Amino acid sequence: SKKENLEVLCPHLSNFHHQKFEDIEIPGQYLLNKDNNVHFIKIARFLPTVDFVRGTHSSYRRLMIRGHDGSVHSFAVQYPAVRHSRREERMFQLYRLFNKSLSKNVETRRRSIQFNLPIAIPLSPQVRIMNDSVSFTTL
Amino acid sequence: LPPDSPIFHNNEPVPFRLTPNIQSLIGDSALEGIFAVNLFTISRALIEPDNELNTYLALFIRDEIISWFSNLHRPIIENPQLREMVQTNVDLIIRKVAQLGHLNSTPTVTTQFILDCIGSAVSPRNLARTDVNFMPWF
Amino acid sequence: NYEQLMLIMNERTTTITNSTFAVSLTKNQFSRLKFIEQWRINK
Amino acid sequence: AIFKQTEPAIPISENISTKTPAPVAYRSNRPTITGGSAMNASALNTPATTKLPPYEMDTQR
Amino acid sequence: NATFNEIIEQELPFVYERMLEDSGLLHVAQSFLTSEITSPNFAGILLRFLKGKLKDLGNVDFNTSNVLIRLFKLSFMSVNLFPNINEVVLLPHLNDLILNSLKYSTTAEEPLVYFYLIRTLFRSIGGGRFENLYRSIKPILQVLLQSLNQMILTARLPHERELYVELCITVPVRLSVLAPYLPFLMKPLVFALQQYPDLVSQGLRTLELCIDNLTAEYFDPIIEPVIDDVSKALFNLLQPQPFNHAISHNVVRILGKLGGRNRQFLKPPTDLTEKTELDIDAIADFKINGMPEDVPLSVTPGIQSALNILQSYKSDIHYRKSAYKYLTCVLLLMTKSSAEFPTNYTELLKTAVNSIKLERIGIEKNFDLEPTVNKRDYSNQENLFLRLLESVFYATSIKELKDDAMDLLNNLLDHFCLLQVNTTLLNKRNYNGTFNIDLKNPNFMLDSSLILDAIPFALSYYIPEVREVGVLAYKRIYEKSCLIYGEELALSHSFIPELAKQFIHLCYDETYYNKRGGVLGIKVLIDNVKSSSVFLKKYQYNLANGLLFVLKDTQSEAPSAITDSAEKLLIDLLSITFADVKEEDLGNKVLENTLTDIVCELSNANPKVRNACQKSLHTISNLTGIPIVKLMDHSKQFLLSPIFAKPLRALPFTMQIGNVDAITFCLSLPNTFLTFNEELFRLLQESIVLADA
Amino acid sequence: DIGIRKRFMTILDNSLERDIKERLYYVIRDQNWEFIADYPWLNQALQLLYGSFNREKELSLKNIYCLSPPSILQEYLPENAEMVTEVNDLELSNFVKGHIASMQGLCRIISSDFIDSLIEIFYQDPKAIHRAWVTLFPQVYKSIPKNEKYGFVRSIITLLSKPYHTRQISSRTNVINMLLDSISKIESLELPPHLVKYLAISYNAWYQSINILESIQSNTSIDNTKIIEANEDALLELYVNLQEEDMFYGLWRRRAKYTETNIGLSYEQIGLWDKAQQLYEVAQVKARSGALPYSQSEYALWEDNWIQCAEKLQHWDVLTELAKHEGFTDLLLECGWRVADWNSDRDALEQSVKSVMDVPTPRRQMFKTFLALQNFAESRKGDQEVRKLCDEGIQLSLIKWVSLPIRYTPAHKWLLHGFQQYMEFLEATQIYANLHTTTVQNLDSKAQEIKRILQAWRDRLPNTWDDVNMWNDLVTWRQHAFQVINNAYLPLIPALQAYRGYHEIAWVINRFAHVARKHNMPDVCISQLARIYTLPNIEIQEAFLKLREQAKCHYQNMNELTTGLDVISNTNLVYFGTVQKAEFFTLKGMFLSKLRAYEEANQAFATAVQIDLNLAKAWAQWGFFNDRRLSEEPNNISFASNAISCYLQAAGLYKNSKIRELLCRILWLISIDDASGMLTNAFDSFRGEIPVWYWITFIPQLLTSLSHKEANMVRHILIRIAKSYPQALHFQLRTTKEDFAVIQRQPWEYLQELNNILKTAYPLLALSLESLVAQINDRFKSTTDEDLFRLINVLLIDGTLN
């Protein structure tokens, strides 16, 4: 089944927004260096019917999160995340640090050049969540 | 460098991945006017701002050096000699980046080193000398 | 035949003003480089 | 802080009456940047409504 | 005036009931309040009469609602006709008018009359002083307007979306720009510019009021989540002179007042269309007389157009009937290559249905691979069949298209009932060997489980005349599944278990349409299956949690019949499943969990689910002879220990209310929970003794 | 009206023959669609072609792999099956056979009902006509045999070149789009004459033509070398009309024959117009006296791109006499020509406008509107036809906007600039009308409106990466509008007895002279700081940006730093400010440290930093100077403490900026292994508020710094992060805490201290985040088949790798 229910899989996250009593933010908004803090998107609720995605060499589950501004953010749960994730995320951090030099130069700003890194935020040192929309493919 | 371990080198025959299928997707006009020119202007924009490449690449190389000496179990080489390893690798990476965005004093086509690189990354005499998991046909 | 069919509208236009005059009157060499050279000589 | 002063109020018209221009048989085969025009805007130096230029087939009897 | 007031106050109900027969008598009341020295007095009498008549403004017929709306319109025009003479008659019961319209539209039968009244009140004023007592209502009004603006994902759309976006913009304010509650206006501004060409000249004006005096620092992060939609709808309004220049030169003035700010927030396009099921080709062979062989061309070049023809109630009926015939042509072409049946299908169906009750069916093993699925084309064909089936369901909402739609729907439903037995027979490939890898499967087809996405679509749809067709569809597949299986196993292997799980999943969705579809499916399910005590007692915990989640999660502006029907269904289900329990200490696995989920929710933030849990604890202590304090013997600590641990000072208000209400219900019970909660009483009395400023 | 329409179409169908070739030749050659020319007639054309079909009851899809049939699926019960033998006494047995007989007649689909039910979809929606034509026409083109394709493609050119298509110009769904799209799906006739495709741009058809013109670049159509170059000409002109310049430069230097053309086009794409201009001159010289024929298309490229580079470099005195040498509206494009009057030669511009303001463009219409505005300006009680010329210009620009594609192209940016120009024309009308009634010396009563509109103009300027022609056009026409008010306040100067003569032209010079320095044009950035001497007084803000930009001019091209040294070192009189001398002194520090100088540059930075202690650029440059002195030695010398102190001072009041490289320098210079505690003193004696929010982006490099020794000054930063921004640290803290907890002292002690500070302050937040993370960690664990799948995949890639 390509679409499995969240309240069957994890009933705490389908019941989250009732027993939540503060403003949690969407994780991974501090990695993208957006100067202030007031316009960050707060998690409204977890959507039901999460997706089971079979890849080429593995498979994972994609859970969707409704934001407080009406937007839906999809994340991929890599449950056996391989232990070279810290080197990956440090390269992601390094190449996201260069995106501000690539917007003050006029020639890279006319052509709208940015580096487009993925936002992967680790939860435990076994599981990380990565941003993953549908209509992402590999070659 | 009196030590010898970290170098940050590339093993592949091709300088990057520009396979036949990607090159037929991008085309001829966009490979000449969009691919190479953006690849030139990125490296031009990174060496302009008066050593920001140095400041980022220093600690982001140093963590890689520490992980390199901690993966293999010899973490005892902790000294300013490690800072010499870091500065050597940083100068190597900065030299290879500034090689792309250098326009000559003589009149020469900008994106010429980049065009020679894409000439050496798409030739079948280089793509055949790589592994089959690279999929050089695709 | 075919080569004369595939070039029916291939008529060159020097400039917008000449195109304007050509469409207006129907209803009613390296001189540039030489000019730039002689103007650089005159200064 | 939150508010700035009053902008100049530009009064748009209420009963303007312009003419829709007739199409023109324009011709521009220059392939250079600025399209054989003084400036390179290429949207400001192009007529509004155009049509196809006159041509003729092979008059080879 | 002092005698005319008591004459008209004693006579106004009789004048009103005379207005419901001869409607010209409105010209009486108009002539009392359009030109008088005693116009504020009659405006006060009329407003105090209409304040009482407002509660039944929704639940009356067309004539009475028309008369009441005209009296309200006259009473509002009397205000802006005499501004310096008393408009102070309107400023009391003005916020009560807004609030009671929003509250009474919940339980109303025709709930759009209240928002038409709010629109008339907003269009009657603007340019006055009493918009400062109204500024204490703006956040509640704008949250109730945006959460009614986008929650109509199945919007009725006569003017419903237009009405809500007309209400959300064009709210009055004495200040030039309205409030810090401007991000509430950004989502209706996109709809006002984009989709309704009669709202456009309103919304453009709102943009100018934000662009002219907002400092361009405070305003730019506000329009940031909507700047691509705003600029893309603004660029559609840049059209020449046959299009209206009064709303094109507005856009030119806006984009000229923004220097580089009209183009500094646009990136390369992230909205490239990727050829969905309304864009793909389903190719068949056609015999053309000028050709030697048949030629393959697509049967679906006009599917999106025919769907837009069928959904619109302003086209012809010839065009609508031909569109329906086209969609059923494409659907029956997709259904044709499974509509052939073998010569011995009856004995094969009987063999395959009594072969389910056997254990250890031997599987012949073979070693050969099957081709893969090609998920994109499978998903497009699956969604295409789903859209065509949903339009067959929608076609029953139209007169003179209903009879053949119902006949074709009956044929399709008892076709899918006969095709479900193949899925049942192939689900025994998941058994008979805990890890078999050498078996044979038919490769990849539309698995006849897409009636599990069409019948919950028909129940969640915004026309009730197709929700009736959805429940008739469920009754028909119940009859056919009980026919071809038998009642003892149609509740464990046919559609009836599977689709029932779908109904529980409709209770967890994020809009009130799907919750109504879920409680509709649950009510027809528990009206069908009551003769057997294995299904409703096996599925009791999940059904109770679904009907409880309808009570917890439902927005306040959703209609009242959702939570009322959910409460009635929960009480009826607990009356059914707790009828056989006679032992006072009888709980094995699932009665313990049902009582746990009930009594752990007496301390909720929502008062509806608190009162529903109290009522359900009362109707299962009057059903069987068990005290309420015997029902809470095992799960009382899971209710009390979260309350006694948190000190009731850092919690928000709705949780303090829930904890205090749960402890009040526990203390009102006979002789239980007397132990050492003095610290909570001391902290609550010291939290209520002080001021709240 | 359905009855008469159906009767007309059925007698037109019965008149023709039932062959597809005859009906295709009827809809292309024979029928004259000039009367139905506003309506999509392809509808009617489809109704003729669908007349040639057969009514076949065996219509069946072959592409869908449809739903599960009961034929083979009741044979998927392999050997354990007690087959029942003729049980026929039920209600099931008649229901099944009645359903079989029902579904037999229901799924017999003829071609007739599909065809004639699709026909009436065409009369409501014109997008079923588009899709139906694009699916049908490449299939019925196969009926046209060989030795007849030439006449068919010639009839296609005759159909597309008809003059009655102008009744569908103002539409997004023309028949030309619906027909060119079906041309593009054929690849046999998909070469039409291809200057027709570039001229079928009177319609929209942009990408329907780019598809056709790019499917000849990748076709073996090499019959001529003059078909290919004309194809490339039409493609480059479509790229120019869409302002897609990168594809223009790529296609040009893929097709060019000279090498200096390639070098000049590359320098022109980058934005170096001096070297590109020199290379175009070299390529023009070698064609006069060479052995190459230059193809008559590179020659125009050399001429026009020379003119464009000379326009960007602002050599208007050359181009004025170049446009005097030949009849051209390059002469009109010196609207800014080092001009202060525009009135002594008013007639010489009116005749040049009026001779060319037929077949009008938005630019020449803008020139006509500016002439009317100047007529209202220099002669009060003017015309107020400016309110009419602006409106006809707005309507012309709207026709040009609808002629472009729907989605935003780079060509729309100039239309947006034209909208801003018309709105500034109307505001200049208001300014001049207020300027004509202040003749009674009513100053400080109507000057407030002028100040408000000028303040609105100061904040309304283009983006800094926009074209320098856009910036130059806005600057020149604002200089015209300022010259009018400076001329009209000129009689009212001595009758006042600072003053209301503004001359804030310097602002729109300085803001221009800044942005050209952003565009790497230093020659015009020096040359624009010479039109500032029109008034000999030293102003509080003209001298500020003037001296700052002139000192920033001489910062690169290191044979020029002495020219920045000698201009600041002799200027000691204050130009209305005590902050300008501090930046002067630290610029002396930059210029002295750029050459090899050890102590005097340190003295220059010291005297730059003692005066105010409020310029963070001086602290940042002193830190850079100390790092440049550090780079010739190992980093363990206590001289680095001065560097980290100037860096920490350079991040405290340099806030809301790019300060993260200073934080990188702090994190790298702190990590030295000095035994003397001077660096910890230099960190811990910093008097100022540390930028806690900008330390978030190095939270991993802080959290791995606790494991490294000589780092407990990282703890103050992490504590100030955890008490103010608690959601940034939480996931990283739990991840590295459960990393260090399973490998088991200051690392875990510091991690438990940070976790305790994050748990006491904000306890509800930590509780909810830990419950969320724990539920994801326990419930999203993969099943058995997914683990087996990933195990077999890693085994298979290792087997094929070994």
Swiss-Prot record, chain B:
Subcellular location: Nucleus
Occurrences of domain FATC (ranges): 106-138
Start and end residues of each stretch annotated as Activation loop: 1-19
Physiological role: Essential scaffold subunit of the transcription coactivator SAGA complex. SAGA acts as a general cofactor required for essentially all RNA polymerase II transcription. At the promoters, SAGA is required for transcription pre-initiation complex (PIC) recruitment. It influences RNA polymerase II transcriptional activity through different activities such as TBP interaction (via core/TAF module) and promoter selectivity, interaction with transcription activators (via Tra1/SPT module), and chromatin modification through histone acetylation (via HAT module) and deubiquitination (via DUB module).
Protein family (similarity comment): Belongs to the PI3/PI4-kinase family. TRA1 subfamily.
Annotated domain remarks: The C-terminal domain (2233-2836) is essential for its ability to interact with activators.
Miscellaneous remark of the record: Although strongly related to the PI3/PI4-kinase family, it lacks the typical motifs that constitute the catalytic site of PI3/PI4-kinase proteins, suggesting that it may lack such activity.
Subunit structure: Component of the 1.8 MDa SAGA (Spt-Ada-Gcn5 acetyltransferase) complex, which is composed of 19 subunits TRA1, SPT7, TAF5, NGG1/ADA3, SGF73, SPT20/ADA5, SPT8, TAF12, TAF6, HFI1/ADA1, UBP8, GCN5, ADA2, SPT3, SGF29, TAF10, TAF9, SGF11 and SUS1.
Protein name (Swiss-Prot/TrEMBL): SAGA complex/NuA4 acetyltransferase complex subunit TRA1
Source organism of this protein record: Saccharomyces cerevisiae (strain ATCC 204508 / S288c)
Name of encoding gene: TRA1
Full-protein residues shown: 3607 to 3744 of 3744
From Swiss-Prot, chain C:
Domain of life: Eukaryota
Localization terms from the record: Nucleus
Quaternary state and interactors: Component of the 1.8 MDa SAGA (Spt-Ada-Gcn5 acetyltransferase) complex, which is composed of 19 subunits TRA1, SPT7, TAF5, NGG1/ADA3, SGF73, SPT20/ADA5, SPT8, TAF12, TAF6, HFI1/ADA1, UBP8, GCN5, ADA2, SPT3, SGF29, TAF10, TAF9, SGF11 and SUS1.
Miscellaneous comment as given in the Swiss-Prot or TrEMBL entry: Present with 4150 molecules/cell in log phase SD medium.
Function according to Swiss-Prot or TrEMBL: Component of the transcription coactivator SAGA complex. SAGA acts as a general cofactor required for essentially all RNA polymerase II transcription. At the promoters, SAGA is required for transcription pre-initiation complex (PIC) recruitment. It influences RNA polymerase II transcriptional activity through different activities such as TBP interaction (via core/TAF module) and promoter selectivity, interaction with transcription activators (via Tra1/SPT module), and chromatin modification through histone acetylation (via HAT module) and deubiquitination (via DUB module).
Family per record: Belongs to the SPT20 family.
Protein name according to UniProt: SAGA complex subunit SPT20
Residues of the full protein shown: 389 to 488 of 604
Curated annotation (Swiss-Prot), chain D:
Primary role: Functions as a component of both the DNA-binding general transcription initiation factor complex TFIID and the transcription coactivator SAGA complex. Binding of TFIID to a promoter (with or without TATA element) is the initial step in pre-initiation complex (PIC) formation.
Organism of origin: Saccharomyces cerevisiae (strain ATCC 204508 / S288c) (Baker's yeast)
Regions crossing the membrane: none
Family: Belongs to the TAF12 family.
Subcellular location: Nucleus
UniProt lineage: Eukaryota, Fungi, Dikarya, Ascomycota, Saccharomycotina
Residues of the full protein shown: 353 to 413 of 539
More info: Present with 930 (+/-45) molecules/cell in log phase SD medium.
Name used for this protein in its record: SAGA complex/transcription factor TFIID complex subunit TAF12
Gene giving rise to this polypeptide: TAF12
Disulfide bridge map: none
Complex formation: Component of the 1.8 MDa SAGA (Spt-Ada-Gcn5 acetyltransferase) complex, which is composed of 19 subunits TRA1, SPT7, TAF5, NGG1/ADA3, SGF73, SPT20/ADA5, SPT8, TAF12, TAF6, HFI1/ADA1, UBP8, GCN5, ADA2, SPT3, SGF29, TAF10, TAF9, SGF11 and SUS1.
